[PDB]
Write a protein that binds this ligand. Structure first.
Ligand SMILES: [Mg+2]
Ligand SMILES: [Mg+2]
Lengths: 55, 114, 98, 104, 121, 67
RNA sequence: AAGGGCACCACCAGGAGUGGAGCCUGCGGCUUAAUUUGACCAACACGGGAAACCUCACCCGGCCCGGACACGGACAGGAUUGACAGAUUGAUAGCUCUUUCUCGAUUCCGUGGGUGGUGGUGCAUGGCCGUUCUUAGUUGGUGGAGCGAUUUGUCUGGUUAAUUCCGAUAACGAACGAGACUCUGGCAUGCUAACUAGUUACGCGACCCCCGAGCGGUCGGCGUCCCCCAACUUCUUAGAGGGACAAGUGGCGUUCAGCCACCCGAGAUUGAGCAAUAACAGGUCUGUGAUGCCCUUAGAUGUCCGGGGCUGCACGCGCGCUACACUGACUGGCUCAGCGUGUGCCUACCCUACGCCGGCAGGCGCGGGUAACCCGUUGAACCCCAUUCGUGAUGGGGAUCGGGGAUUGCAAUUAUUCCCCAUGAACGAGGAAUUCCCAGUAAGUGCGGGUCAUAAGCUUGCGUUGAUUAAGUCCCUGCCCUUUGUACACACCGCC
């Protein structure tokens, strides 16, 4: 359809409004500290950001 | 102040920038013997230093490719213009870089070697 | 792609004025961040660059959620004779201060 | 000018912060400014707990991560002006600095 | 009699003072702006009722929006409410005022329990 | 599948010939037989529609209805 | 089968329970157009899976191409695109139709060829992670033996949590794991520093005794980093260090490796993280622009939009919460925490002091806080002290259900949540069975974070109160090492 209904449904909040900043996944997001990264992607890159294991 | 975010979020954003830049350099400089990324940030400007084996290969005709990557990193993260510089550094003892050796092994396997 | 000329030339001259261009993967983005005044949708520029890659005038690199198109040497003369330009004006990456 | 400034340093490791907090104040004493004592703020520990598995099947083992952010406050106070006196920051990568004044 | 006043007074009961006769949820609904879809549906029912023959029920009108709250000016219409599969035509009784349209087109049929299968050993 | 409805017929355009909806007479006299869209975004170059009960502007999308 | 050692995912002695009741939640089954699906110690409050839309992958319907590139037709005398009205549509989808305007080379058609897919395949795979197995075990070289598969090394014994070490020794020399290591808690009146942490002293004050004290008592009242206009770091923070080693004494011990008791000491075993070889057809292609092969790709298994469902109930099961009360409930008063969060690239959405309105849920204006600067000295619960209740399904219990009032959102019905007044159901300690646990431990008790536009019965942590029992054993359930039997080797869930 035209622009009046193609993206008409609001996504200004809710689970569909948020996606992973790496793989654009819509499940298991980590919004803490504005990380905005998927759980799998965070485990993949936590050494790179700097979250290292201590205990 | 209000314009600047908290320190925790700032460190998180720095880590995000580091990881994204590392991924971009990995996917872009894979055939150029990429080793790793080192960034030096100052309030005046930022300095990004790439560790790689073939500096003459990552650098295009009269530094064409290094200019291309500098423009890419200028555009994507929205730095102030002229506040980022890209240095390509030849690594020491490239046999000690697991990234470079793994990429070379992948190159060998893609070549058809057993 | 049904996108018109008036933004096609704008995207083309942005792509020629500097050797590269960066586009986030979001087909529903109301406006591409740079070239702000032209009011060009992001899907149009994404598919224009896809067509240029298909014809081989640009090569594409993909990070997490971004494209990193690199204009090639076959992209020089195509943009030149599409924009009707003499071979003296170069992208910034090609010639600097020389 | 009469200037009284504040210098804050923060990073993720303690060795770099300590060596900066040492050499900077030593340079200040060699450059005869009286220095307000270094204030080590309480550490911000950023904890993230995440299941190790990417699927959910397993023994419910949680992977926990940390990020220790240490910050130090040093105040440089001189009877005369400061900024024209000291300009060199001598800052290694990995540590952040913000230079403010008493008004700021 | 919705709240002690007759239906005739409810027909000319304007929205601003009608919210003091609805419950809290309906009053909050009408306090917020009704979108263009609801207004279009109201115009459609008005058109159907005015074009309806005298002493005879109007024609059926269909809709997916079952979150519409019932207004007194829609009484007597033939409205077909979607249940997820088909449109269910339903009367508007003079007792249905504070109730949403979705309550009268069930989204499931009630279960007829049969012999249990392999489970629950 | 087995869609209960038949496949929806997509519109095919009328394949209009040369426009020619304006005429001059006795060795040249302009005769606008189509309505003018007066807005700036329409301009004075384009003409309006000639519907049996209203006029429509292709660009300005205004509707002048005559009763 | 024997011998030795070991474990609260085993037992003993106990504690708390579960299973008995209600409710929440997840599986199966039933029903459904659809109740998307995986997973069956090592699945069943798991997929960080607390779904109104989105999520969505399921169903009922409607659009768009977001089908590149190439070839050939098509066309500026129009390739083709948008759209007002009416019908039509759930729809103000020009989606279709009547009807004409308008964009202009970007498209259209067909042929190949893309491409995409939460489509399939974890029994094709990468990666991840779980389990074997957190037990202490594992391997190379050289040498010895055996025709060889293999064996010694890698052990009689003693010791340890530990093939941990001592000791013998056809072995020698190694290597990983364990250990070692990092964080954590416990002592540092030792050092450095402190207006974004305090203390002490002093000066203003304010109130009581003022009989009379007066350098009397209290102040989280104001001040002395306002720059000359006090000192100090114990309390707080975080760095550099120290500190504990079976070190000292007695005993046991081949007096070796070590073991028991005790003084001094803060501490004589703080919890974690990492964690070998080999393996599972263990789980994930529904995390990925990780991905092979197959399927679809224009009436779409793409994508968007509307709605419904994922909650649906004769029933079984799992984890939980609430309780069955007087060691209690209610009412009032008094009184102490610690993790840790707080305004955002897309992305709109913060923590909130204080003042006013309302009975409450909430609303109305002034601010603070991007943070040891504000919430906050986080005035928490439990508990403590007083009132009432009185052994009753009772003032325990609040399930079910009626009405009304607010919050968030586009939308609260299949009730989002909250508040008020109504009803007070089972339940009176729970069969056979069964879970977890040795000191700040179980358990009682609240508080942060995750999910959050709105939200916790879940989870991760934090703090408060705070124990009984035990310092053993192999009885069950298992594990390691040695010997032994084997007709097993997909390895006893075997073979026959
Ligand atoms: Mg009572
Ligand atoms: Mg025999």
């Amino acid at each position: 359809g035209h622009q009046q209904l193609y993206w008409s449904h609001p996504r200004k909040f809710g689970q569909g409004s948020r996606s992973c900043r790496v793989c654009s996944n819509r499940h298991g997001l980590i919004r803490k500290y504005g990380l905005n990264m998927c759980r799998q992607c965070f485990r993949q890159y936590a050494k790179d950001i700097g979250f290292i294991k201590l205990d | 102040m209000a314009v600047q975010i908290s320190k925790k979020r700032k460190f998180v954003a720095d880590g995000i920038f580091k990881a994204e830049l590392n991924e971009f350099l990995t996917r872009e400089l894979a055939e150029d013997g990429y080793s790793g990324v080192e960034v030096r940030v100052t309030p005046t400007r930022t300095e990004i230093i790439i560790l790689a084996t073939r500096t003459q290969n990552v650098l295009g005709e009269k530094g064409r490719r290094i200019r291309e990557l500098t423009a890419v990193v200028q555009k994507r993260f929205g730095f102030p213009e002229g506040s980022v510089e890209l240095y390509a550094e030849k690594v020491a003892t490239r046999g000690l870089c697991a990234i470079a050796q793994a990429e070379s092994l992948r190159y060998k396997l893609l070549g058809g070697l057993a | 792609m049904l996108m018109p000329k008036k933004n096609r030339i704008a995207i083309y001259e942005l792509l020629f004025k500097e050797g590269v261009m960066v586009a986030k993967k979001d087909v529903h983005m109301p406006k591409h961040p740079e070239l702000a005044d032209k009011n060009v949708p992001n899907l149009h520029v994404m598919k224009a660059m896809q067509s240029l890659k298909s014809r081989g005038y640009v090569k594409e690199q993909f990070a997490w959620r971004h494209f990193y198109w690199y204009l090639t040497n076959e992209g020089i003369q195509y943009l030149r004779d599409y924009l009707h330009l003499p071979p003296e004006i170069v992208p910034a990456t090609l010639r600097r201060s020389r | 000018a009469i200037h009284r400034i504040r210098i804050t340093l923060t990073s993720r490791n303690v060795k770099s912060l300590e060596k900066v907090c040492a050499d900077l104040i030593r340079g200040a004493k060699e450059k005869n400014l009286k220095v307000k004592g270094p204030v080590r703020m309480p550490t911000k520990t950023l904890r993230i707990t995440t299941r190790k598995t990417p699927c959910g099947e397993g023994s419910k083992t949680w992977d926990r991560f940390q990020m220790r952010i240490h910050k130090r406050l040093i105040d440089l106070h001189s009877p005369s002006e400061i900024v024209k006196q000291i300009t060199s920051i001598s800052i290694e990568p990995g540590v952040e600095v913000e230079v403010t004044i008493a008004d700021a | 009699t919705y709240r002690g006043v007759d239906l005739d007074q409810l027909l000319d009961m304007s929205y601003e003072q009608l919210m003091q006769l609805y419950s809290a949820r309906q009053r909050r609904r009408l306090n917020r702006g009704l979108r263009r879809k609801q207004h279009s549906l109201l115009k459609r029912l008005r058109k159907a009722k005015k074009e309806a023959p005298p002493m005879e029920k109007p024609e059926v009108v269909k809709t997916h929006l079952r979150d519409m709250i019932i207004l007194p000016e829609m009484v007597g219409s033939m409205v077909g409410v979607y249940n997820g599969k088909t449109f269910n035509q339903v009367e508007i009784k003079p007792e249905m005022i504070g109730h949403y349209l979705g309550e009268f087109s069930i989204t499931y049929k009630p279960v007829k329990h049969g012999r249990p299968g392999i489970g629950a050993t | 599948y087995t869609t209960p409805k038949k496949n929806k017929h997509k519109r095919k355009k009328v394949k209009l010939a040369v426009l020619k909806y304006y005429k001059v007479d006795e060795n040249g006299k302009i005769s606008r037989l189509r309505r003018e869209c007066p807005s700036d975004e329409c301009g004075a170059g384009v003409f309006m529609a000639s519907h049996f009960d209203r006029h429509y502007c292709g660009k300005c999308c205004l509707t002048y209805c005559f009763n």
